[PDB]
Design a protein around this ligand. Structure first.
Ligand SMILES: [Zn+2]
Lengths: 94, 176, 76, 141, 117, 49
RNA sequence: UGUGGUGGCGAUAGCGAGAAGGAUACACCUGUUCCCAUGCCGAACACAGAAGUUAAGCUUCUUAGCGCCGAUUGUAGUGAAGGGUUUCCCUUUGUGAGAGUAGGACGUCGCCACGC
RNA sequence: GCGGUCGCCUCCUAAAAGGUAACGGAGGCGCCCAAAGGUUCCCUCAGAAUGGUUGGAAAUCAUUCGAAGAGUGUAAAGGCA
RNA sequence: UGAUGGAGGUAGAGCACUGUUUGGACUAGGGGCCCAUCGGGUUACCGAAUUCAGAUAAACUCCGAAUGCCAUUCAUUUAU
């Protein structure tokens, strides 16, 4: 119902090095009624859904309007980190 | 012959009734007989090939081929280009007459009558029968002095075991 | 005491002409050993699989569907 | 001096390698695994030591997964031979591990024996470690 | 038993003949097509792909049985419809065929009536 | 085994051509309808004895 | 519009699976005396024929099971500019692949002939 | 110094044009074919499954699947259905 | 310098091929030991045919980068 719904830029170039330090999760969405955007996230809002709601349950991205029903596809990190990278959302509708 | 008129009169329409072909063009037929005589001993003696070609030319109406080697193996003691066997293709009316001879003459010259061996099954209308021996009227004791045999490979246009069995059965082939 | 260290010599393959040159008669375009590029308009294959330029003009490279490529010359 | 894990060659010699970085390659079979955090060669015999320090806390078997295997070879000269002639004789069988290939995996046993086994395993390998589950897994069939 | 249908091999031999030279800008093709009953002919350029003159076997005017008899007639009619448009140096397609009839009659009748080979 | 060999115009008698043979496969003297430069005419050439 | 012949355009044209048709046409199909042919064989090749049939091929239509074409993201790598240990890692500015896909896709265009 | 090597041809090292050294890592050469050449026609492979008299896992056969898993005089790359 | 065009198998991915290899399922029948002295073949590797997930490479490739490189009756600046 509510998440970290933000937007990004086309090529935010190598500033992403600093995104590795001060704690942001860059994320990815592409689907049916909206083609493709990248969206910010933080790690303290989705692992709580992974524990509480589960690893493969429904996420409702909201643009203060109609629903966007995404699901996880892949999130594999670099090792010896314990922090999120490469979150590919993937929406399949109702 | 006998068998073509058997097709045109009696063999076809009962087989049509058993399976209800919407066209007469789906009557399965008989094409080929392939006859082979693998020797192996002729590598030792080139005079072994002097007689099998004569025997096959007497039984058929054709001189058979002289088959190649296709391999080079010393564990079977063969180079390339080695004359080993002999093919006979058969088409047309000599097909039917040779099958007539097989029905009337060959099968009642078999020791220990038990029936034609069934298990040549192969699914797709391909029954082969090994022949071991003097099972033919155009053969003498004083001519044939070896224990050579024959080979039959009849290939049809059928698609089941059952239609192939009934093609061979309404024309003859007394199985077990 | 090593049983190695013996060499061929560099026989200097590779394209010797760009796209859009002004090319005279007969000059070499792309020297092969083995058919990596087929010829096209006004280009022949030598004994050692080279490529010519018969008609004076402009070298341009193309495709042959998916696999392999062509050289051809178009005059003025 | 016996090698636990030999190969079949195709080639006596290889170049001395150059390792930088990898990632990913999560826990797949078992339930408890290390992660190398550094970059070195790891030889044959260290894997023998890791096997034995794994198993001699394990009781009645359990589950042991080895996910790293030697492939490449070393050479060395004699003592006192000058620089000069061709490469040394091939001796040993080594394979490098970058930042994060999981070393081994365990399952079927509760955590305490597992963490003892992984501490015993980690003190016989020259690389710093951690301990990982199937921690964050959306793919679990 | 599979029986490979005969147009497949005819087209294979076409493709292994056509890849030398069509060359049909001012010296166009001929074309030769069997059936079990008839014969067809076209005269095509490249790469317009346009037949400039054509004649069937037995769809316009017949002579006799569907034979070399017809083949001489078609070899008449193709060149008689051709040289009105001013064509001189035509190139044969062999099709995928050989020369024991029904084609060389077309060839010879193409030779006499005004087409150079 | 294989020896260098020169040919011979059978009319004007000049050593025109040169080739190679394997003289256990072919012990004889060859006969080819080669060309003659001095006559401008096809001439049956043979091995020099 | 159908049917046949014949062309380019990267399989987005294919494969597999399912259905219908014989106006004309194509093909199977009946033969071999004739031109021809079989390293044996009218199976092919070549020559003649109109008894039979949509059965197969061929043509039309359905299917995203298989194969193919696949945006935008991100991430790995890297030019230039830097900084600490120099085994190697990190930071600004430019450029970004492969895997993963949402999606597309059971063709498009050209000429001639015969019917319609 | 004792050993090894001295001309030519393929591949890697070679930093995706060309070039590039080391007593770096690997294999060959000092021929052969009168057709193993030229032209013109015709053809498509290795294997695998299933039956078949001597017949053996594996000779000769027959059917089906099969883009190559074959071959190409000779070493290796690059090509060629 | 900027624009445009192609030559190509380097970094990284690196599975499709060729090499090296980790655990599961399946039998086709090797199963030495069988019950045996007439059908059940009991255990094991289940190896090859497969079929799953998972690694890997200077002389592995289904793919594939920045950069330099070759050219243009191209544009600007400069002096060879
Ligand atoms: Zn003379």
């Amino acid at each position: 119902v509510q998440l970290e719904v933000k937007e990004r830029a086309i090529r935010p170039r190598s500033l992403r090095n600093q995104l590795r330090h001060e704690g942001k999760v860059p994320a990815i969405v592409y689907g049916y009624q909206i083609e493709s955007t990248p969206i910010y996230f933080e790690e303290k809002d989705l692992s709580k859904i992974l524990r509480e709601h589960g690893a493969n349950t429904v996420i409702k991205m909201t643009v203060d309007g109609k629903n966007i029903n995404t699901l996880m596809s892949k999130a594999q990190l670099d090792t010896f980190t314990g922090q999120m990278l490469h979150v590919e959302f993937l929406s399949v509708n109702m | 012959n006998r068998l073509k008129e058997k097709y045109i009169k009696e063999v076809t329409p009962s087989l049509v009734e058993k399976f209800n072909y919407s066209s007469v063009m789906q009557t399965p037929k008989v094409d080929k007989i392939v006859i082979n005589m693998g020797v192996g001993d002729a590598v030792s003696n080139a005079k072994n090939l002097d007689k099998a070609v004569e025997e096959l030319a007497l039984i058929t109406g054709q001189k058979p081929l002289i088959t190649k080697a296709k391999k080079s193996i010393a564990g079977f003691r063969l180079r390339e280009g080695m004359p080993i066997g002999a093919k006979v293709t058969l088409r047309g009316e000599r097909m039917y007459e040779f099958l007539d001879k097989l029905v009337t003459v060959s099968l009642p010259r078999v020791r220990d009558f038990h029936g034609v061996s069934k298990k040549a099954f192969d699914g797709r209308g391909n029954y082969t029968l090994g022949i071991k021996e003097l099972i033919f009227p155009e053969v003498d004791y004083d001519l044939v002095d070896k224990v050579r045999g024959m080979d039959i490979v009849i290939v049809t246009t059928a698609n089941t075991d059952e239609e192939s069995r009934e093609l061979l059965a309404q024309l003859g082939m007394p199985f077990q | 005491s090593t049983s190695n260290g013996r060499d061929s010599e560099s026989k200097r393959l590779g394209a010797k002409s760009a796209d859009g040159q002004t090319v005279t008669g007969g000059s070499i375009l792309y020297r092969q050993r083995g058919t990596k590029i087929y010829p096209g308009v006004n280009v022949g294959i030598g004994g050692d699989d080279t490529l010519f330029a018969k008609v004076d003009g402009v070298v341009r490279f193309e495709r042959k569907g998916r696999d392999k490529k062509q050289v051809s010359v178009y005059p003025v | 001096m016996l090698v636990p894990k030999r190969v079949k060659h195709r080639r006596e010699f290889r170049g001395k390698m150059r390792g930088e970085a990898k990632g990913g390659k999560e826990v797949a079979f078992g339930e408890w695994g290390l992660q190398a955090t550094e970059s070195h060669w790891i030889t044959n015999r260290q894997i023998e030591a890791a096997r034995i320090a794994m198993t001699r806390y394990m009781k009645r078997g359990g589950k042991v997964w080895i996910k790293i295997f030697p492939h490449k070879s070393y050479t060395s000269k004699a003592i006192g031979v000058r620089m000069g002639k061709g490469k040394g004789a091939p001796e040993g069988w080594v394979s490098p591990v970058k930042r994060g290939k999981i070393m081994f995996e365990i399952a079927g046993v509760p955590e305490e024996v597992a963490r003892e086994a992984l501490r015993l395993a980690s003190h016989k390998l020259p690389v710093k470690t951690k301990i990982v589950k199937r921690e964050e897994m959306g793919g679990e069939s | 038993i599979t029986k490979p249908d005969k147009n497949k091999t005819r087209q294979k031999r076409h493709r292994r003949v056509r890849n030398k030279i069509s060359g049909t800008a001012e010296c166009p093709r001929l074309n030769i097509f069997r059936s079990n009953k008839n014969i067809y002919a076209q005269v095509i350029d490249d790469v317009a792909g346009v037949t400039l003159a054509s004649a069937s076997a037995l769809d316009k005017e017949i002579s006799g049985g569907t034979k070399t008899e017809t083949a001489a007639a078609v070899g008449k009619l193709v060149a008689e419809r051709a040289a009105e448009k001013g064509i001189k140096k035509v190139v044969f397609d062999r099709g995928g065929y050989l020369y024991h009839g029904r084609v060389q009659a077309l060839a010879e009748a193409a030779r006499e009536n005004g087409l150079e080979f | 085994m294989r020896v260098n060999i020169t040919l011979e115009c059978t009319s004007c008698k000049e050593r025109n051509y040169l080739t190679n043979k394997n003289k256990r496969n072919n012990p004889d003297r060859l006969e080819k309808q080669k060309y003659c430069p001095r006559e401008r005419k096809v001439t049956l050439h043979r091995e020099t004895k």
